[PDB]
Amino acid sequence: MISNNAPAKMVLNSVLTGYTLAYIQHSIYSDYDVIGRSFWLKEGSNVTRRDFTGIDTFSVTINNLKPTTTYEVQGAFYDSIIDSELLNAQIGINLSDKQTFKMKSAPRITGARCESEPVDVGVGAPIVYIDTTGEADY
């Protein structure tokens, strides 16, 4: 009768993208033996593994990511049974299906300039015209 259960594969509800930070909404664990959650990013050339201690919250914040680099997200909970070597092998983890997202680009200034109107009496007020190429919200 006695048996062991691997953590149920989670579902990544949504991912919000920042050109340096990544926010992911994922389902909740349902197995008692769960000890931690791990993720496996894919730069497209090298696979990077990231894990965060604690399972209190439904959201995560992946840091230290290369800007303007699409990534693939796949991870799941690993219980006390799963070992570090076994986790690296990813044999019994039963990870979640991968999901691809595009990582935004940091702002840049295309050109710098300043012009002002000549005035008959008084002084023309300085103004700065600067053209950007970014995509940040503000």
């Binding site: 006695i2 062991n4 008692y32 033996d33 076994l86 019994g92």
Partner: protein
């Protein structure tokens, strides 16, 4: 014959990375000079492994290293762990025969 580290909600679940197993001392063990219990371990399929000759011990721990390193590779041919398990213990006589029957999980 009970699994001490069984999870609170589910009796058939053990939280610990390994399996720690305990059992009561057999009665009438005093008259007999020696009794060693033979513990049979199985998998999802009925596969004999980890047959342990144990004397005067009322608690056995099936360590994770004892679990995956030893027989997971031996049977499956690869490092892949095994999760579903069955346990079966039975007292054996030092000179006489064994007990009436094996003990249920």
């Amino acid at each position: 014959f009970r699994v001490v580290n069984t999870a609170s909600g589910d009796v058939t679940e053990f939280v610990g990375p390994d399996v720690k197993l305990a059992w009561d001392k057999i009665p009438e063990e005093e008259i007999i000079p020696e009794i060693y219990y033979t513990l049979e371990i199985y998998d999802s399929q009925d596969r004999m492994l980890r047959s342990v000759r144990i004397e005067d011990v009322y608690t056995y721990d099936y360590l994770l290293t004892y679990n995956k390193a030893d027989f997971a590779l031996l049977n499956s041919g690869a490092l892949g762990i095994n999760r579903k398990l069955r346990f079966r213990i039975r007292a054996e006589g030092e000179n006489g025969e064994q007990s009436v029957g094996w003990a249920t999980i």
